[PDB]
Structure formats: structure tokens, C-alpha cells
């Protein structure tokens, strides 16, 4: 039908990749992933002649517009392959080596924040840019190494929600590929379910070629005539603000609107300092009255 603007974000982080390859033994698994993605973009740009690809990597200190080159020469790959495929693959391996050399250079400083949401947002802006230029399908791909330490998704939660709402406005499914020890990533699973995206988690770096060639090929040209393969289901619930556990039925502030599994101490808001009404909370604490 139409050229599908391909959007691929690769979450590269040595804190995750070192953790994964030390947990297992597949050194160069990230290289295997990169080669698989090279074949994936080849299969995509051979599926359609103009389904243009946006490739962005988010490193530890920030993000990088990988494909294409900025608005401001060895060949590792073979010379017998296709021209456009070779140009893209050579450009990406050059950009990847430059980013990895940079990452080796500035390895020793510490930044504990994931940049996945910012990378996703910048990619969505570029999707707006491409779609506003000249009619193009929007499909967003994330590659993550989930074997790293799940430190704090709490600050990541809000912009991820904002990105979900934006992609909902933009009819862009958010398809998730996870490689890690943890089977489940709740926010990503919720993201896939809300955006009609595809969630998938495995561990072995082998067979990802067949995995994301078979499953991760759904385009908006043929989305309604393809069943989604996701098996997990999400309650769309959140952990409590002061006890950190998910709540089924509970309480939220009339002002801050944060989930309270229990009564806040001092009857004041733990988010926006609103003192509440004692008769209200006593009625909330009321037991039912039962006949003797």
C-alpha cells in the first residue's frame, strides 16, 4: 500500500550487556542482534521500495541519530550485496563503531537514568517530521537488554505514559523486543497492549532472526488481518506511592491523584501536602453495621 516509516530504537547499555553475557556466555550477543537487525532492515526495505527506516541508539549518556547521517571509510561488509542495503549497513556499522569508541572513551562517569523514554520521544518527533514531509505508516521498534538490574522504573513511568498517549494520537504501535532474565516488564507490556503493540521476551541471542522475522513483521497495511501473538495480559495497575505495592481498590488524592493503598500518616497528602478531612476518612474507615 504505502511506505511504512520504520522506527527502530536500540537501547544499548554496557550495564545491561555485560550483565547478560556474564549471566550467560554468549559474548558478542549484541553483535548478533545488530546483524539480525541488519537483515531485518534488509527484509523491510525489500518488502517495500520506500518504507524508510529511522534508526536511533540510546547510549548511557544520551541518544544518537544513527540513521541517517547528521545534517552537519573502511567497508567491513561485503561488496557483492545490494547498493541501498550496503549503504545503510555500512553507515550503521560506522556509526555503531563511532558510538562504541565514544562509549569506551567516556565509560568512567556515572549516569543512572535510562534514556529509553527520551529516545522514544525524539523518535516520535522525527516520525512527525517524516510524516509531515510529503501517507506513511508509523511503526516503532525497541530493542532492549532486560538482563540488567531493574533499578527504578518509577521516574520512567510518566514519560512512557506520555509517549503512549502520543503514539495513540499518531496510530503508531509500539512493538517491544526484550532479551533478559526477567520474563515480564509490566510497563512495556502495558505499552504494547494499549498501543496495539507486540511484546516479546526471550533469553537466547540465537534464533532472534527467525523470531523477529516471523513475528515482528506486522505492518499497518495488514494489521487487522493478522492476529497479535501476545499471550500476557495486564491489569493496568500501579504500585502504591507510600507502600510500593499494586492496589486493586484504594484511594487517590483529590489534588495530586496518587494511589494510596492505605491512609497516609498525618492524613496529609504524601505528594502535594493536602490535609484531608477526618470525617471523610472515618467514613472510609467505617465497618459495615451488622445485626447481632
Amino acid at each position: 500500500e504505502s511506505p511504512s516509516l520504520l522506527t527502530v530504537i536500540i537501547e544499548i547499555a554496557p550495564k545491561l550487556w555485560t550483565t547478560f553475557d556474564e549471566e550467560g556466555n554468549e559474548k558478542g550477543s549484541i553483535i548478533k542482534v545488530l546483524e539480525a537487525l541488519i537483515v531485518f532492515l534488509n527484509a523491510h526495505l525489500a518488502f517495500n521500495s520506500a518504507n524508510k527506516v529511522a534508526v536511533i541508539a540510546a547510549y548511557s549518556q544520551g541518544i544518537k541519530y544513527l540513521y541517517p547521517e547528521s545534517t552537519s571509510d573502511l567497508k567491513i561488509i561485503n561488496s557483492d550485496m545490494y547498493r541501498r542495503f550496503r549503504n545503510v549497513d555500512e553507515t550503521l556499522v560506522e556509526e555503531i563503531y563511532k558510538l562504541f569508541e565514544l562509549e569506551k572513551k567516556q565509560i568512567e562517569q556515572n549516569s543512572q537514568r535510562s534514556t529509553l523514554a527520551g529516545a522514544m520521544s525524539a523518535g516520535l518527533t522525527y516520525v512527525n517530521r517524516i510524516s509531515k514531509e510529503s501517507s506513511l505508516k508509523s511503526r516503532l521498534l525497541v530493542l532492549t537488554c532486560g538482563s540488567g538490574s531493574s533499578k527504578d522504573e518509577i521516574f520512567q513511568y510518566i514519560p512512557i505514559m506520555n509517549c503512549i498517549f502520543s503514539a495513540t494520537k499518531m496510530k503508531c504501535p509500539i512493538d517491544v523486543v526484550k532479551i533478559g532474565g526477567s520474563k515480564e516488564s509490566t510497563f512495556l507490556q502495558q505499552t504494547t497492549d494499549a498501543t496495539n503493540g507486540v511484546y516479546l521476551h526471550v533469553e537466547s541471542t540465537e534464533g532472534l532472526i527467525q523470531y523477529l522475522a516471523t513475528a515482528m513483521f506486522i505492518d499497518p497495511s495488514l494489521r487487522p488481518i493478522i492476529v497479535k501473538p501476545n499471550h500476557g495480559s495486564v491489569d493496568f495497575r500501579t504500585s502504591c506511592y507510600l507502600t510500593g505495592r499494586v492496589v486493586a481498590v484504594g484511594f487517590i488524592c483529590s489534588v495530586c491523584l496518587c494511589v494510596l493503598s492505605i491512609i497516609p500518616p498525618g492524613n496529609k497528602c504524601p505528594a502535594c501536602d493536602s490535609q484531608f478531612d477526618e470525617h471523610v476518612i472515618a467514613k472510609l474507615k467505617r465497618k459495615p453495621v451488622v445485626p447481632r
Binding site: 537483515v39 527467525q210 488481518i225
Partner: protein
């Protein structure tokens, strides 16, 4: 019907000849480009595992909403002999063509290509200045030759013979002149890759043993080729028709190094606007387009006035209309050009009028013509007033009896495609002279 015509031709190509075509990765890449999305997905899934599948697994995977499209994809898949579906263990065991499979695999991996993507010399030069200019020159010469406006640079004698034999732009030997057939105007209406594909289909049809699969593989890799580089001059049949398509201006060859122009790229794939025309009830032309080719083709069916930078003006006359009509050029062809040359403001006004008339009545009691009938139906009324009769000439069988027999004989002619007209109420029908003998034999039996 370009993919339909090529797929039909390859289905006409036998199974092992198809398998010979499926040997090389460049041919497999071009054919994969031809395949529809469902079959494309199927083969890219199965190409990386040597696990044959039964049809039941694919059927369970397939959502039934697009099951007709799935049927089309697998019908093409089987009829191209790209599949080997056998009822193994009672189940229709699905198997891709293995030569196609491995050649696609090597093309995707960048593995063994045997320079099917091209025997490369890689002496790149500028193409906009030599290749594009010579290409535009030669294509301009053949295009104005095909227009009929006078031009000195005649085409090759091979293509001249192909035009003489073919029903495209008839070089009528009684007149000694190339003459616009209705098929010639179809070619004029065609897209550029459509014109190239019609030309190569006709040349492949006329050419015989010159190895047909050599021409096929060479055509597929020539489509697969890239612009602006020198390459090694391969099969000799491929080389001599390569020199032929050099004389067509497709490649810029320095008699061994050859430099393929942009025409190979357009043959491979496609790449208040230009070509947008404002219609007028006064038949005035407000074209947002200009070329000497545009004037040359507008000379056939439009009375023009002058040439300016984008502003080509004129007035469509009924003399111009009937000049188009008397060439055998179809009014449907004319409105094909017209409806491919519409303008934004007028089509927005037409859609506003359509949405206004939608709420009043579904039929609107108006003729079905979306382009504004104030100007557009004036041609369409002239289109209906052009033909406006039905002529039947030759044999005719009359005064049938039993209606039975009349329906039987008439139905039989329709089945064999020799029936030209019938009337239940008079129990009469007309059949072509070719089918006369067949109908008579059936009547006796």
C-alpha cells in the same frame, strides 16, 4: 496488470524452466519484489529454516478476514511452481522451490551471488551529465517518434521491426508511416515502467532460440542494476541484446565498459501539481505543466494556442475531439488522460458537490461521473454521441423454436467466447465467423 502480465507469462513458462529462473539470487530478488505481501512474508519466514510446513499450520496462522487475499497469494505461489505442495501423510505438505529458497538466502546474507547482481568494474563517473543526458536524448527521440511529430533520429531497426510486426504505433506499409493505433495510445497513456515492461514482454514474446532464460536472467539483473558505474561485458546473447538496449539508450556503453542510466532504476521501481489541468466549460486548458513532449501529445487531441513556462493554454475543439476519435483512439482513453490530469481546486469543488448531493438523495438523479460534468460530461456526452450505434455483420441464425434450443446454442457460444449478441425476446443471436463452424457442429450434435 503489469505484475499480472509478468506472473501470467511466468506461469506460461513451464515448471523446470521456472526452476531454472529461480536459480540465481538477482532473479529471485526481483521475483520476490514482484510477489504480494502475504507470500513475501511466507517466503521470508520459511527461507531461514529448512522445515517444510503443512498447509494446516499456515491456515491456523492466517486470520480468515483476508482469506481471499491469502488464496490469491498461494494460488500465485503454486501456479508459478514456486511451491511444491504435495499431500504428504494425507496433508498438503508445503514446500518452497529450493533453488529460489537458497538463492534468496544467499542474496539476503550477501553470500554467493556469482555476480548475479552484476559483474562489477566499479568505475563510477557522473551520470547526470553523460548518462542522464544521453538517456534523455535517446528517450526523447523515440518518444517523439512514437508521437509522430517529425524527428530525424529514427530508432533502431530491431525496434522498428518490432513496431512493424506488433500492433503498437502501426508502421502501415501501404502508407509507409508509423500510425497511432489504439494500442499505441494505450502505450502513450501507460506509465514509464509499464511501457518498458510491455516492450520487454513483447520482445521476449517475439524472441526465440538467443536463449530465453538468458534474456530473462539478464533482464532481471538489469532491473537489479544500479546507476553510474562501469561493468564487465557474461553471456554473449546477453551481451548482444545489451548492445541492443544500448541502442535504445537504456545504458551508456563506451562500446566494453557500460554505464546504466536512470532508466534501469525506473524499470526496477517508481523513483497545484505538474500535470494538473484545470478544466473549463469554455474548454480552455489551464495546464500546470509544460514540455515539448506535452505539446506534442496535446497536438493529437487538443487545439492549442501558445507555450509559456508552466502555463500551457488552449481550447479543446470538437475538431480536436473528433481528430482523437477518428484515429481509433478511445474516448475512455481520452478520459483516462483527463482524469489523470485533474486539478486540486476543481476536484475539491467536485467532492464538495458530491457530499452536498449525498444527503439529498443517494441516486441524486444524475449521471455517475465524479469529475465535474459541467466540463467533463460535455466530453462524455460527446463520447456517448461518438459511438452511439451497434453494428453486426456476417452470418445470422434466425427464427428458433424451442426456447430451450435457442438458449442451449446461445449459451454454448458464450461458453466458448464466440457470441457477439443475443436477444431472448426475438430468440436470435449473432456469433463470430471464427466460431461459426463450432456452433454448427454443436447444433447437429
Amino acid at each position: 496488470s503489469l505484475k499480472h502480465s509478468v506472473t501470467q507469462y511466468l506461469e506460461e513458462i513451464p515448471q523446470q524452466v521456472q526452476n531454472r529462473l529461480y536459480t540465481s539470487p538477482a532473479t529471485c530478488l526481483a521475483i520476490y519484489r514482484i510477489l504480494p505481501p502475504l507470500a513475501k512474508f511466507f517466503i521470508m519466514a520459511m527461507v531461514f529454516n529448512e522445515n517444510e510446513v503443512p498447509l494446516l499450520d499456515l491456515d491456523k496462522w492466517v486470520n480468515s478476514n483476508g482469506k481471499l487475499q491469502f488464496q490469491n497469494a498461494i494460488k500465485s505461489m503454486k501456479s508459478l511452481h514456486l511451491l511444491i505442495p504435495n499431500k504428504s501423510s494425507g496433508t498438503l505438505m508445503i514446500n518452497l522451490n529450493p533453488t529460489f529458497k537458497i538463492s534468496l538466502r544467499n542474496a539476503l546474507t550477501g553470500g554467493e551471488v556469482q555476480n548475479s547482481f552484476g559483474v562489477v568494474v566499479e568505475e563510477n563517473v557522473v551520470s547526470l551529465d553523460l548518462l542522464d543526458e544521453y538517456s534523455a536524448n535517446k528517450w526523447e527521440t523515440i518518444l517523439h517518434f512514437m508521437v509522430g511529430t517529425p524527428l530525424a533520429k529514427i530508432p533502431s531497426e530491431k525496434v522498428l521491426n518490432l513496431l512493424k510486426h506488433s500492433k503498437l504505433m502501426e508502421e502501415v506499409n501501404s502508407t509507409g508511416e508509423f500510425k497511432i493505433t489504439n494500442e499505441g495510445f494505450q502505450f502513450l497513456l501507460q506509465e514509464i515502467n509499464s511501457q518498458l515492461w510491455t516492450l520487454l514482454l513483447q520482445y521476449l514474446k517475439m524472441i526465440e532460440t538467443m536463449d530465453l532464460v538468458d534474456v530473462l536472467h539478464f533482464i532481471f539483473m538489469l532491473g537489479a542494476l544500479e546507476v553510474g558505474k562501469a561493468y564487465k561485458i557474461l553471456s554473449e546473447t546477453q551481451r548482444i541484446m545489451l548492445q541492443d538496449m544500448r541502442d535504445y539508450g537504456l545504458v551508456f556503453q563506451k562500446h566494453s565498459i557500460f554505464y546504466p542510466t536512470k532508466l534501469a532504476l525506473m524499470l526496477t521501481s517508481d523513483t497545484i501539481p505538474d500535470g494538473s489541468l484545470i478544466v473549463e466549460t469554455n474548454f480552455k486548458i489551464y495546464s500546470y505543466s509544460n514540455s515539448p513532449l506535452q505539446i506534442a501529445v496535446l497536438s493529437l487531441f487538443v487545439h492549442l494556442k501558445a507555450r509559456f513556462v508552466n502555463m500551457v493554454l488552449g481550447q479543446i475543439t470538437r475538431e480536436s475531439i473528433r481528430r482523437a476519435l477518428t484515429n481509433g483512439i478511445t474516448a475512455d482513453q481520452i478520459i483516462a488522460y483527463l482524469e489523470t490530469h485533474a486539478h486540486p481546486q476543481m476536484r475539491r469543488l467536485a467532492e464538495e458537490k458530491l457530499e452536498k448531493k449525498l444527503e439529498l438523495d443517494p441516486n441524486c438523479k444524475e449521471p455517475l461521473q465524479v469529475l465535474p460534468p459541467t466540463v467533463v460530461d460535455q466530453i462524455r456526452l460527446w463520447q456517448l454521441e461518438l459511438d452511439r450505434v451497434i453494428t453486426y455483420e456476417g452470418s445470422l441464425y434466425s427464427d428458433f423454436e424451442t426456447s430451450q434450443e435457442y438458449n442451449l446454442l446461445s449459451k454454448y457460444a458464450q461458453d466458448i467466447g464466440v457470441l457477439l449478441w443475443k436477444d431472448d425476446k426475438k430468440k436470435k443471436f449473432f456469433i463470430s465467423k471464427e466460431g461459426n463452424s463450432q456452433v454448427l457442429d454443436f447444433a447437429k450434435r
